Design an enzyme around this catalytic site. Structure first.
Site, PDB file in Angstrom:
ATOM      1  N   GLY F  45       0.768  -1.232   0.000  1.00  0.00           N
ATOM      2  CA  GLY F  45       0.000   0.000   0.000  1.00  0.00           C
ATOM      3  C   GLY F  45       0.801   1.286   0.000  1.00  0.00           C
ATOM      4  O   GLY F  45       0.236   2.366   0.196  1.00  0.00           O
ATOM      5  N   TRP F  47       4.319   1.652  -2.135  1.00  0.00           N
ATOM      6  CA  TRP F  47       4.973   1.873  -3.422  1.00  0.00           C
ATOM      7  C   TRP F  47       3.962   1.924  -4.562  1.00  0.00           C
ATOM      8  O   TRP F  47       4.143   2.681  -5.523  1.00  0.00           O
ATOM      9  CB  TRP F  47       6.020   0.790  -3.683  1.00  0.00           C
ATOM     10  CG  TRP F  47       7.402   1.210  -3.293  1.00  0.00           C
ATOM     11  CD1 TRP F  47       7.739   2.131  -2.347  1.00  0.00           C
ATOM     12  CD2 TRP F  47       8.634   0.753  -3.865  1.00  0.00           C
ATOM     13  NE1 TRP F  47       9.103   2.263  -2.279  1.00  0.00           N
ATOM     14  CE2 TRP F  47       9.676   1.430  -3.203  1.00  0.00           C
ATOM     15  CE3 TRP F  47       8.955  -0.167  -4.868  1.00  0.00           C
ATOM     16  CZ2 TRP F  47      11.018   1.216  -3.510  1.00  0.00           C
ATOM     17  CZ3 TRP F  47      10.289  -0.378  -5.170  1.00  0.00           C
ATOM     18  CH2 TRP F  47      11.303   0.312  -4.496  1.00  0.00           C
ATOM     19  N   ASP F  65       4.450 -10.067  -6.443  1.00  0.00           N
ATOM     20  CA  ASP F  65       5.147 -10.081  -5.164  1.00  0.00           C
ATOM     21  C   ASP F  65       4.952 -11.450  -4.533  1.00  0.00           C
ATOM     22  O   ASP F  65       3.828 -11.960  -4.504  1.00  0.00           O
ATOM     23  CB  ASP F  65       4.622  -8.987  -4.226  1.00  0.00           C
ATOM     24  CG  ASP F  65       5.498  -8.799  -3.006  1.00  0.00           C
ATOM     25  OD1 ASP F  65       6.681  -9.196  -3.060  1.00  0.00           O
ATOM     26  OD2 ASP F  65       5.008  -8.255  -1.996  1.00  0.00           O
ATOM     27  N   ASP F  81       5.275 -15.574  -6.865  1.00  0.00           N
ATOM     28  CA  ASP F  81       6.671 -15.160  -6.797  1.00  0.00           C
ATOM     29  C   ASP F  81       7.149 -14.682  -8.171  1.00  0.00           C
ATOM     30  O   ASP F  81       6.368 -14.529  -9.115  1.00  0.00           O
ATOM     31  CB  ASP F  81       7.532 -16.297  -6.254  1.00  0.00           C
ATOM     32  CG  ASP F  81       7.185 -17.640  -6.867  1.00  0.00           C
ATOM     33  OD1 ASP F  81       6.104 -17.755  -7.481  1.00  0.00           O
ATOM     34  OD2 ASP F  81       7.997 -18.580  -6.742  1.00  0.00           O
ATOM     35  N   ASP F 106      11.931  -4.612  -4.513  1.00  0.00           N
ATOM     36  CA  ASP F 106      12.203  -4.417  -3.094  1.00  0.00           C
ATOM     37  C   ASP F 106      12.887  -5.661  -2.539  1.00  0.00           C
ATOM     38  O   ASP F 106      12.252  -6.709  -2.389  1.00  0.00           O
ATOM     39  CB  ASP F 106      10.914  -4.123  -2.325  1.00  0.00           C
ATOM     40  CG  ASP F 106      10.579  -2.648  -2.294  1.00  0.00           C
ATOM     41  OD1 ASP F 106      11.516  -1.831  -2.179  1.00  0.00           O
ATOM     42  OD2 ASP F 106       9.382  -2.303  -2.386  1.00  0.00           O
ATOM     43  N   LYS F 146      16.733  -2.645  -4.882  1.00  0.00           N
ATOM     44  CA  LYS F 146      17.203  -2.529  -3.510  1.00  0.00           C
ATOM     45  C   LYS F 146      18.356  -3.504  -3.302  1.00  0.00           C
ATOM     46  O   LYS F 146      18.259  -4.677  -3.679  1.00  0.00           O
ATOM     47  CB  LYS F 146      16.068  -2.805  -2.520  1.00  0.00           C
ATOM     48  CG  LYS F 146      16.477  -2.818  -1.053  1.00  0.00           C
ATOM     49  CD  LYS F 146      17.216  -1.550  -0.656  1.00  0.00           C
ATOM     50  CE  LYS F 146      16.316  -0.331  -0.712  1.00  0.00           C
ATOM     51  NZ  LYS F 146      17.044   0.868  -0.227  1.00  0.00           N
TER      52      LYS F 146
END
Ligand SMILES: Nc1nc2c(ncn2[C@@H]2O[C@H](COP(=O)(O)OP(=O)(O)OP(=O)(O)O)[C@@H](O)[C@H]2O)c(=O)[nH]1
Ligand SMILES: [Zn+2]
Lengths: 440, 356, 135, 42, 246, 323, 113, 62
Positions: F45, F47, F65, F81, F106, F146
């Site tokens: 909720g 990005w 995700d 995934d 991320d 990241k």
RNA sequence: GGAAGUCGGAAUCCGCUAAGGACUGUGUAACAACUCACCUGCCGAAUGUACUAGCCCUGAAAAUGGAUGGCGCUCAAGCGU
RNA sequence: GUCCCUACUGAUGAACUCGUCGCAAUGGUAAUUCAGCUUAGUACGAGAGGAACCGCUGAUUCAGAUAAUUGGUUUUUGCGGUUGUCCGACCGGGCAGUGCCGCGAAGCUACCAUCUGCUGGAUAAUGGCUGAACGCCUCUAAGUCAGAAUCCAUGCCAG
């Protein structure tokens, strides 16, 4: 690997007693009206929370232990559909999941109510209401919990059938000799008694042939129904005959002591033939001690020879009360199963690509024999003592010394003191047990 | 720390008492139950192990052993005891004639200026009538006492100590009728008893002494930390300890002149280290080789007694065979066992050539 | 069955938790970081420590990325802490080294670089068979 | 584990005392009393 | 004749034993179950010896020899050397060598006629090996493994080699050796053949958890006095090999 | 507490990750002009919310995700995934033919396993994000990843420098300065004809570099020193032994390197036979002390190593080498 | 058992005396005391220290060549046990040792002439 | 060890039978019960392991 | 599939009777076999169901060692008159 | 915006003439857990798998000691080297609050070293024997057998 590792599931009354005694004994119980209201709330918040995770850990243990039928090999899926009524299995497991979420909702609501409470009495009634509402939800689970205990004990007592391994399937009418063939070859305890449905379930045995392991499945036995309606017992043999990869050994009884006609036995073989549309089928003509092949009506010879005229079907003979035919019918079937599986394995690797597979290369490295190019054998040193030596047998009363039995007579593993000078070879036998000088 | 040793005070007497002799049955043969010796020091041995089930079975193990010097105790007395509802009471002590000056030093705090008149009239009752007072007191032990003990003392002249005062101790006789052990005690008067006769090789014994004193220390070393149970400062050491199950690895004679010689090393040497025991001297008598650490400092009197119970281990039923005994210098990093093989290794020195 | 050694005599522990020790096998790992010692108890504030022939839970810090993806059992084969054997010999090695093994005691690699301590080879037969120098 | 004061541990030790360690200690006490008898009689 | 055995609950027979054509070495420890299973196969035909080497139990990985000689590393004491000398007859030459690679059973493979050594063995070790064992010496690797003794087992009748040895490497090794060579596994798929099993000209002792197909190739490569398996059985019972090791 | 997380809980967003993304957008604006957005690890909720605000609304917002986060409305969020090829084909069927203009990832591994296992699992997930980004990106696209500070981050910086044009290590405000939580951005996707297999391979990227020259001066000119070998041993080079003839020590141009690395200088005759060896043995120099030092090089000190170096200069003066 | 000799200085290293260092190439170094071990770790040369036996042999302070020193050596081929051989070996080393001492003394008188 | 006054004999009449006989019912029945309690399986399954010594007949000698 | 009183659903009658259920449990693959309810013979005269009233036990307890005030008390030195 | 009594831990002590050897009321109390060998690839099991009693050997934690060996410590200022300055130089020394460096015995120390840690009775849950209450029956009522790391003691510390 089995399903015996499923923890036992209690009834509704034991579940309440287990949960409520766990809260009483693993948490403190003494609170006072003179304490601070924040201490009073924290005491009763802890009791309500503790009862919830105790309930959630047993509910999660039941769900995460019973097999999921979707993630299953489709031989086992219709087996437990037949045995346990798979629609009822997911309904009962659904009622466990629903009661798990409803208990979590009650705990979430009453912890909030305890936050705004003002007195010890109000905290006490809110704790009791939450615990009693959790107790009534478990009491409604009484019928699913009885069902889940019965399936678990049946599942723990279910034989291990490997569907991909080499398998011999024994099928036929009741009272032909299906179970007596399994005891003759394997040491599996399959009941043999002269009534209709002795074999209630699927019994598994194992044999050794060509230094390889095989499986023999004993089936209940099927009747001449058109498969739309059948027994729960008979359908269990049906799904064994369909969803496994075996070598079917259909047993026919020429003599009429099976209680069924030869015309009925031929007709069942023709009806259940599409279930064997892939695997090899062998017909074993059993109880040859009563009536041989040759005193049968020549019309009846023509039909079973027309059964042989079908492509992959072969007819062999045996007698399970004299054992003079049951040995080579084991050797004939297991040899034919050995050749096909090797030929299938060679084909998967020699597929039409131009390159031999990696996993078919390693076996060809394993099977290859390397020999010297000269061909001159190296000369072998074997003494003449062993060429006349006698094989040691433990049951022979005239064995040799065998020093482990010297240990047993003189003590044990930790008591007996071995002597090393007795094997010493010296010029004088008196020179052993000597204190050899070392430092001067 | 342990609450069993809770009164962490100094020991009441330097010698330390047995506090329990083995339980006696009359069917056994007559034997004494304890002895005394003096702590000399420790050495290193190699033992050819025979321990079935051990990883070191039929291998060589290097172990630390303790040497206790044991001159032969001289029996001078006999003390009878009777049973009472209040406990155990001493009824009669019978001494002998010709008491040595060493034990006579024990009954004096200033021996150098005393008239040395101890036991002078007791020497006269052995020839007063015919010895009627002596025989009467022994018959009182025979017909009334339930267990009898023997007074024995050690000799300090055989030991290299500056002390001259002997140590006098009561040793219990076990295994027989009270009549039989009294006739032992009278016959054993004025006679030296060796440690060869009291104990034997390959035997767990019980060692009793007073530990090393450390004076006033705090809770860092007295208790072992990062009312009685609260850790408080005070005296550490000089406590009475009874140690249990120590094996006798060797009993030297002192006459043999090859005490440290084994059947595998043929070096004629004694137990005394090359240069002497540090702060003790030379051991010229019978000695007992005890495996492991043993309480008390060097020069301290050691009390050895028999085990109270029959043993429940195969470690007590093990025959001990020694391969070699260290005799090198305790005073440094000694690499030489005897004087002879040091001059053999070193060669001729300057002082050796000038003297010869 | 846990990987605790069976019948190992007392010897001076030299590698505590959080020690980097070399990897002596040809699996591809270069060093191992000890995070836990198998079989060693823990009472209070005592760092568990291991010696030669004690398997430990290790993490590869430098080496092949495939071996760096998971936590591995590892038996210590060398130790620079001087320890005593029952024959009276006090001995020590140049460095601390170990080999990655499975829970059953079988090592992933095929050869062991450098020597192997005698206690590690006597307890684990697979390390003993891949040892070129045993001393 | 079993305590040092367990009943079955004590019963195992009593069987060891009577059958194994017993005659060993009785034999060593016959030799030692024989040497003490020699000194006292001399 | 091939039998299964265990020294302890361990299946590594070759780690704890050394079998030749004139003597057998057995590690000394606890009971004699390992000793008696060798005695029940050798009814006093060749001498047997309960031995320790360098104060450790792993005797089969520290010594190497044939019926003409025995070799031990420099860490063996004089008492173990004398115990080996008194036990064995005078037809056996016992030599202690000062080779830095002290695991001689891992670095030397030998039969009565040839020897494979570690590539970085010394010259004084290689010439002593030829002198004492009385055999010819070659430097080789068994499927890029330099510890030949662990991954390769050999008698005068045949040899068992690491499973992932290439076919080309098997032919050049067998031609250099003069005996038939077949790649195979022991002890349920373990690649450590020498540490798992010991073989001589007339019998073999392997681990307990070797499979029934795996015991058949030990019978086949190493012939018997009965003459049942001459090594050509593999191309006859190929179907067992194909299904078992696919 | 975190001031940016407190600002989110009051009015801003679900978490402080949205504050991280607007700091990257403020540092470099790419969300204003792009059209397709694909997040390989959708933050819950936060990005997707800032992606919904700055970008044109409801324009190909892929929310794949592995963590089962709450499905953000107006964002196409998937709970599967990313590493599996079946999920890649599921992504292909959902984008039709429109490849992602901006790709985001991320990296949130299970940190806690001594910071080395966590760093590699972060780096392996970052390379897997690079594989899907290199599979689906426009010429001149943008990639947000990241990463954690490690030696693998140096390799990840190199592979972005080799494959892209503009490389920037952001390290913006609203980021966790306690840990190594560092943003990186890659711009300028070159669009090669074929994606190179071993360039994207984690084994080739995270392969250790060639080891530098060891301090042979430290091992020779002062060998009474410290810094024991905490790293492992080289490939091959088992038994830890090295020997050559003494002539190769004389004939080499780096006498410090041979002395430090090798164990023994041998005087044994080669099978061909060297007359330089026999001459070197039969010299009035190299008597006793040189022969004793040459047998055991590893136990020598400063004066023994120096005497060997003065000895080889005297033989080279005898033999006629230039220096 | 075996009386070992110190690597650094050559005095007899008896069991439990000193320390032993094992190197990565397979070589073990036995030391008799801490003085010998510490001097080894700081990499000093025992041929130069005047208390070590390597220096004394190098400087000629004890002789190396003669028949009696050749008679003692380390044996790698074992012999069968023979009680007559072991007893006559013991009488030899009594004769061997006293012959050495009477030749050691002559060697020292020759240096001091 | 039995009570003083009870004699135990091996039955040479049927297979695997002992006779405890005596004058005192207290001594005979207690000594019989001691044998049952000393041969009792532990940590096993009662429904499968049926090994033990059990009292079969109680009565009088005459 | 097999189900004979006893895996289930529903009915639960008649005869012989001294009395015996279309059956209360054990048991069989189904039977068989045993057992209960009920009945007869032998021994023997008082029983047995539900309540009420006293006295006693349980009917919940944490955390320094201690309290019918203490010793102690049992056809009381306790309870009722 | 509020260095003293007592308690505890240790050490002495008058009177009983000084000592030597003792007894033991009372107070405290101590051991704990795991693994391996054998039993045994046995019982059991279709297979996969897979015990236990007796016997033997180690290890963890705790407790009490000890310094043969190993490591550490150095005012042994013991010996040697070396920097600055000085006693005219050599020799021998001084100062630098022990100048610095190396080795360093003795002593103290370290699960960084080694040793040792012991057996009777009565019980609880529970399993029984005989046997009334209650003409069956019953482990309880009278009588009584066994049984937990529990309890009380011995061993052990103080006196
Ligand atoms: N004469 C003769 N009788 C046999 C032979 N084999 C089996 N029988 C008898 O026939 C009966 C056959 O039943 P089962 O042996 O159990 O074989 P089944 O076909 O599986 O029968 P169910 O187990 O009841 O399904 C047995 O009871 C045997 O007594 C045989 O070879 N010869
Ligand atoms: Zn030395």
């Amino acid at each position: 690997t089995g399903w015996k590792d499923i923890p036992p599931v209690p009834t509704a009354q034991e579940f309440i007693d287990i949960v409520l005694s766990r809260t009483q004994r693993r948490l403190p119980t003494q609170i006072r009206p003179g304490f601070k209201i924040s201490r009073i709330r924290a005491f009763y918040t802890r009791k309500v929370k503790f009862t919830q995770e105790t309930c959630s850990e047993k509910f999660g243990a039941i769900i995460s232990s019973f097999p999921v039928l979707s993630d299953q090999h489709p031989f086992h899926r219709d087996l437990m559909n037949i045995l346990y009524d798979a629609d009822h299995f997911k309904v009962a497991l659904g009622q466990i999941s629903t009661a798990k979420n409803l208990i979590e909702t009650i705990s979430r609501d009453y912890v909030r109510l305890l936050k705004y409470a003002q007195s010890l009495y109000q905290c006490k009634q809110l704790k009791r209401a939450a615990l009693g509402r959790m107790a009534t939800l478990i009491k409604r689970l009484k019928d699913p919990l009885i069902y889940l205990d019965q399936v678990r004990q049946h599942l723990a007592r279910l034989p291990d059938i490997n569907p991909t391994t080499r398998t011999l399937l024994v099928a036929g009418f009741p009272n032909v000799g299906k179970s007596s063939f399994v005891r003759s070859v394997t040491r599996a305890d399959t009941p043999v008694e002269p009534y209709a449905f002795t074999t209630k379930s699927l019994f598994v045995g194992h044999l050794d042939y060509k230094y390889l392991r095989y499986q023999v499945i004993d089936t209940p036995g099927i009747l001449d129904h058109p498969l739309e309606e059948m027994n729960t017992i008979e359908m269990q043999s049906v799904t064994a005959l369909a969803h496994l990869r075996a070598a079917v050994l259909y047993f026919m009884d020429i003599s009429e002591q099976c209680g069924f006609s030869l015309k009925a036995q031929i007709n069942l073989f023709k009806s259940i033939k599409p279930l064997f549309a892939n695997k090899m089928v062998f017909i074993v003509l059993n109880k040859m001690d009563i009536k041989k092949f040759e005193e049968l009506d020549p019309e009846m010879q023509q039909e079973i020879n027309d059964l042989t005229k079908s492509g992959e079907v072969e007819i062999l003979r045996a007698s399970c009360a004299t054992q003079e035919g049951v040995q080579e019918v084991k050797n004939h079937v297991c040899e034919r199963l050995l050749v096909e599986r090797v030929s299938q394995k060679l084909k998967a690797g020699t597929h039409s690509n131009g390159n031999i597979g990696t996993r078919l290369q390693e076996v060809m490295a394993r099977i290859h024999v390397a020999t010297p190019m000269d061909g001159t054998t190296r000369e072998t040193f074997i003494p003449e003592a062993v060429k006349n030596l006698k094989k040691y047998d433990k049951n022979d009363p005239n064995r040799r010394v065998l020093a482990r039995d010297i240990e047993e007579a003189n003590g044990g593993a930790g008591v007996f003191n071995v002597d090393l000078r007795k094997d010493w070879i010296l010029e004088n036998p008196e020179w052993k047990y000597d204190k050899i000088p070392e430092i001067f | 720390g342990s609450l069993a040793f809770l009164p962490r005070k100094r020991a009441a007497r330097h010698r330390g008492r047995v506090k329990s002799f083995p339980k006696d049955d009359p069917k056994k043969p007559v034997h004494l139950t304890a002895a005394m010796g003096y702590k000399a020091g420790m050495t290193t041995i190699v033992r050819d192990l025979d321990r079935p089930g051990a990883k070191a079975h039929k291998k060589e193990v290097v172990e630390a052993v303790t040497i206790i010097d044991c001159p032969p105790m001289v029996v001078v007395g006999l003390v009878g005891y009777i049973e009472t509802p209040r406990g155990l009471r001493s009824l009669t002590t019978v001494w002998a004639e010709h008491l040595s000056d060493e034990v006579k030093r024990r009954f004096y705090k200033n021996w150098y200026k005393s008239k040395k008149k101890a036991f002078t009239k007791y020497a006269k009752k052995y020839a007063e009538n015919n010895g009627a007072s002596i025989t009467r007191e022994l018959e009182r032990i025979k017909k009334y006492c339930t267990v009898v003990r023997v007074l024995a003392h050690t000799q300090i002249r055989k030991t290299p100590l500056k002390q001259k005062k002997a140590h006098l101790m009561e040793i219990q006789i076990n295994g027989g009728s009270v009549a039989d052990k009294v006739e032992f005690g009278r016959s054993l008067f004025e006679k030296p008893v060796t440690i060869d006769t009291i104990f034997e090789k390959d035997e767990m014994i019980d060692v009793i002494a007073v530990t090393k004193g450390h004076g006033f220390v705090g809770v860092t070393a007295r208790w072992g930390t990062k009312q009685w149970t609260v850790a408080r400062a005070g005296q550490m050491g000089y406590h009475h300890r009874t140690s249990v199950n120590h094996k006798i690895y060797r009993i030297g004679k002192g006459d043999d002149e090859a005490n440290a010689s084994t059947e595998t090393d043929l070096t004629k040497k004694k137990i005394t280290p090359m240069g002497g025991f540090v702060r003790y001297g030379e051991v010229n008598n019978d000695y007992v080789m005890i495996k492991g650490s043993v309480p008390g400092v060097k020069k301290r009197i050691m009390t050895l007694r028999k085990s109270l119970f029959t043993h429940t281990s195969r470690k007590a039923l093990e025959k001990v065979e020694l391969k070699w005994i260290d005799t090198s210098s305790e005073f440094g990093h000694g690499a030489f066992q005897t004087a002879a093989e040091k001059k053999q290794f070193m060669g001729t020195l300057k002082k050796d050539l000038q003297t010869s | 069955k846990r990987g605790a050694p069976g019948g190992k005599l007392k010897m001076t522990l030299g590698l505590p938790v959080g020690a980097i020790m070399n990897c002596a096998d040809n699996s591809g790992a270069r060093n191992l970081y000890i995070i836990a010692v198998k079989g060693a108890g823990a009472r209070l504030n005592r760092l568990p420590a291991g010696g030669v022939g004690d398997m430990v839970m290790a993490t590869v810090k430098k080496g092949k990325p495939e071996l760096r993806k998971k936590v591995h059992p590892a038996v210590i084969v060398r130790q620079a802490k001087p320890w005593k054997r029952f024959d009276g010999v006090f001995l020590y090695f140049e460095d601390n080294a170990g080999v990655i093994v499975n829970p059953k005691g079988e090592m992933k690699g095929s050869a062991i670089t450098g020597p192997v301590g005698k206690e590690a080879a006597e307890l684990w037969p697979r390390i003993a068979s891949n040892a070129g120098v045993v001393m | 584990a079993k305590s040092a004061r367990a009943s079955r541990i004590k019963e195992n030790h009593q069987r060891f005392k009577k059958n194994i360690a017993g005659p060993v200690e009785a034999a060593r006490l016959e030799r030692l009393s024989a040497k003490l008898m020699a000194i006292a009689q001399a | 004749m091939a039998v299964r055995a265990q020294f302890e609950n361990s299946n590594e027979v070759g780690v704890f034993a050394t079998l030749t054509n004139s003597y057998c070495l057995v590690a000394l420890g606890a009971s004699e179950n390992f000793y008696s299973v060798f005695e029940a196969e050798l009814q006093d035909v060749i001498p047997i010896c309960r031995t320790t080497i360098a104060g450790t139990r792993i005797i089969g990985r520290l010594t190497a020899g044939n019926r003409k000689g025995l070799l031990v590393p420099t860490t063996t004491t004089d008492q173990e050397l004398q115990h080996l000398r008194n036990s064995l007859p005078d037809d056996i030459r016992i030599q202690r060598i000062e080779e830095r690679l002290s695991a001689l059973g891992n670095v030397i493979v030998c039969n009565d006629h040839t020897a494979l050594i570690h590539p970085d063995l010394e010259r004084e070790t290689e010439e002593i090996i030829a002198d004492v064992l009385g055999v010819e010496v070659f430097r080789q690797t068994i499927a890029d493994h330099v510890l030949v003794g662990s991954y390769m087992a050999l008698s005068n009748q045949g040899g068992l080699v690491h499973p992932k040895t290439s076919i080309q490497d098997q032919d050049e090794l067998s031609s250099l050796l003069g005996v038939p060579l077949v790649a195979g596994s022991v002890n349920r798929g373990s690649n450590v053949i020498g540490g798992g099993m010991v073989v001589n000209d007339w019998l073999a002792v392997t681990g307990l958890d070797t499979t029934a197909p795996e015991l058949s190739v030990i019978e086949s490569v190493f012939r018997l006095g009965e003459g049942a398996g001459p090594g050509a059985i593999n191309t006859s019972m190929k179907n067992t090999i194909v299904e078992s090791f696919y | 507490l975190d001031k940016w997380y407190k600002l989110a809980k009051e009015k801003g967003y679900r978490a402080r990750a949205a504050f991280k993304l607007i700091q990257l957008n403020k540092k470099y604006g790419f969300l204003e002009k792009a059209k397709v957005v694909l997040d390989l690890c959708a933050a819950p909720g936060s990005w997707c919310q800032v992606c919904a605000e700055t970008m044109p609304k409801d324009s190909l917002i892929i929310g794949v995700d592995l963590a089962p986060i709450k499905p953000i409305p107006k964002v196409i969020t998937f709970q599967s995934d990313i590493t599996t090829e079946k999920c890649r084909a599921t992504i292909r069927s959902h984008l039709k033919t429109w490849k992602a203009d901006v790709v985001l990832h991320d990296g949130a591994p299970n940190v806690g396993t001594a910071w080395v296992q966590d760093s590699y699992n972060q780096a392996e997930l970052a390379l897997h994000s690079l594989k899907l980004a290199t599979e689906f990106l426009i010429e001149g696209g943008t990639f947000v990843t990241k990463v954690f500070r490690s030696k693998d981050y140096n390799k990840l910086l190199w592979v972005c420098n080799q494959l892209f044009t503009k490389v920037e290590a952001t390290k913006p405000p609203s980021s966790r300065n306690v840990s190594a939580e560092i943003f990186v951005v890659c711009r300028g996707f070159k669009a090669p004809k074929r994606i190179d297999p071993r360039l994207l391979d984690p084994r080739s990227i995270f392969e250790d570099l060639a080891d530098p020259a060891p301090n042979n001066e430290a091992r020779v000119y002062n060998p009474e020193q410290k810094k024991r070998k905490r790293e492992g041993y080289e490939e091959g080079d088992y038994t830890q032994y090295k020997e050559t003839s003494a002539i190769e020590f004389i004939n080499t141009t780096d006498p410090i390197a041979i002395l430090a690395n090798y164990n023994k200088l041998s005087f044994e005759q080669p099978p061909n036979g060297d007359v330089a060896l026999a001459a070197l043995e039969k010299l009035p120099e190299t008597t006793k002390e040189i022969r004793a030092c040459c047998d055991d090089l590893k136990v020598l000190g400063k004066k023994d190593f120096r005497l060997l170096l003065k000895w080889r200069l005297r033989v080279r003066e005898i033999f006629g080498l230039p220096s | 058992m075996r009386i070992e000799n110190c690597f650094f200085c050559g005095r007899p290293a008896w069991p439990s005396k000193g320390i032993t260092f094992m190197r990565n190439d397979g070589k073990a170094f036995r030391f008799c005391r801490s003085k010998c071990h510490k001097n080894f770790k700081m990499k000093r040369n025992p041929r130069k220290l005047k208390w070590t036996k390597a220096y004394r042999k190098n400087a000629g302070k004890e002789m190396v060549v003669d028949s009696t020193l050749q008679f003692a050596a380390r044996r790698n081929v074992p012999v069968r046990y023979n009680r007559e051989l072991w007893q006559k070996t013991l009488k030899a080393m009594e004769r061997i040792s006293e012959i050495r001492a009477r030749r050691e003394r002559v060697f020292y008188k020759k240096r001091m002439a | 060890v039995m009570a003083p006054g009870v004699e135990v004999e091996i039955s040479k009449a049927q297979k695997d039978e002992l006779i405890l006989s005596g004058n005192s019912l207290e001594a005979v029945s207690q000594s019989a019960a001691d044998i049952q309690q000393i041969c009792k399986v532990r940590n096993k399954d009662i429904r499968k392991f049926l090994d033990g010594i059990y009292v079969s007949e109680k009565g009088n000698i005459v």
